[PDB]
């Protein structure tokens, strides 16, 4: 996290979101710096797993 920013320099990080975690994404990342009020980056969402099994259909599927 400790990172010196050069003047007139933009540093674009790569926010990689994984596939493992709680089903509810309740995150509050804080970008705290001296002489500046806290600028918290809040990430919210949900984690889900998809059903990737092809079911046999010799018997009719009932909806």
């Amino acid at each position: 996290p400790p990172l010196g920013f050069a003047a007139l320099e933009e540093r674009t990080w790569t926010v990689s979101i994984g596939t493992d975690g709680p089903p509810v994404v309740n995150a509050r990342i804080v970008w705290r710096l001296q002489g500046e009020p806290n600028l918290v980056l809040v990430i919210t969402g949900n984690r889900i797993i998809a059903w990737t099994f092809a079911p046999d259909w010799g018997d009719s599927i009932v909806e």
């Binding site: 050069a6 003047a7 007139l8 320099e9 933009e10 674009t12």
Partner: protein, 317 residues
């Protein structure tokens, strides 16, 4: 960052300019000096003064930017003008110059040239410079000239618009003019007219800005102007607040200069001049030093006249 003094001649003026840009204590200490990428004298002077061509690179305050600028010293003794032509670009390549011709075409996305008017004589000069922009003001001694170029300060991320390059001059560089000209087109940075200021659109297309309309100028640039001095677009009278501006109880207000375009496709606010402001003329004038928050600003007036709407101040830091 400031170089005040008197230059014995135009060539000495350019020499002092380059020496200041390359050896100023502030520039060298902060490592913001510009790099001279080209310097040549191609033409064979006949009945004219030697022509000096220089191209310089500016890295910006952060050192991550790429700014390319050019300066030309074109003069004619038989007409006794020693114009200094300025232009900007993004890339340079000496090999791309076609046989003969000129090198300014080699610039990628080249732009029309502007210039400042002077001649061979002792001349007081006022110099300002910074890692992103430079300003030149030459006092003709009972006339004042000015020009400059650099990066404006837009309100959008530089990640998406990293090249807000602007070039401004007192008169268009496409023609040769005598500094004693009597045309309204000779004016300053606050009020460009008839190809006196160019800004580079984020799309990469250079757009000209004029405070007043002109039949000779292209129709496209009419919609885009400088609002502070272009209040006549919305006001329904010739006389407005701007022309009648005055200091308040011995205090001189400073008004910034805005870059705005009103196009049919859409509107967009581009940025502001860095270090240039509009100030009134009353009880004041040229060579006036106005302080602000411990910051001093110099006052200057356009060559055309020295009235209220043709007067501006420049920050000296």
């Amino acid at each position: 960052a400031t170089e005040f003094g008197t230059a014995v001649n135009h060539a000495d003026l350019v020499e002092r300019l380059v020496q200041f840009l390359t050896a100023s204590p502030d520039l060298v200490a902060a490592g913001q000096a510009y790099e001279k990428v080209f310097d040549n004298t191609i033409p064979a002077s006949g009945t004219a003064i030697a022509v000096r061509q220089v191209t310089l690179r500016a890295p910006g305050l952060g050192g991550t930017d790429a700014i390319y600028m050019g300066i030309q010293s074109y003069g004619d003794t038989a007409l006794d003008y020693y114009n200094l032509r300025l232009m900007g670009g993004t890339a340079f390549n000496p090999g791309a110059i076609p046989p003969g011709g000129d090198y300014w075409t080699a610039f990628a996305n080249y732009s029309p040239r502007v210039q400042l008017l002077a001649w061979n004589q002792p001349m007081p000069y006022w110099f300002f410079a910074n890692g992103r922009r430079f300003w030149i003001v030459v006092k003709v001694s009972t006339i004042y000239e000015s020009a400059g170029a650099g990066f404006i300060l837009p309100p959008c991320p530089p990640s998406q618009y990293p090249y807000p390059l602007a070039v401004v001059g007192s008169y268009r560089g496409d023609v040769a003019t005598r500094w004693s000209d009597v045309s309204d087109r000779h004016r300053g940075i606050s009020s460009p007219y008839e190809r006196s200021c160019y800004l580079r659109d984020p799309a990469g297309r250079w757009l000209g800005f004029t405070v007043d309309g002109g039949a000779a100028n292209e129709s496209d640039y009419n919609n885009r102007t400088l609002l502070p001095l272009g209040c006549g677009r919305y006001a329904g009278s010739s006389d407005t607040v701007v022309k009648q501006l005055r200091d308040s109880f011995g205090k001189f207000p400073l008004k910034a200069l805005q870059f705005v375009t009103r196009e049919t496709e859409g509107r967009r606010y581009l940025g502001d001049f860095d270090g240039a402001f509009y100030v009134p003329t009353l009880n004041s004038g040229a060579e006036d030093v106005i302080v602000e928050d411990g910051v001093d600003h110099v006052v200057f007036q356009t060559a055309w006249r020295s009235g209220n709407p043709w007067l501006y101040a420049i920050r000296k830091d």
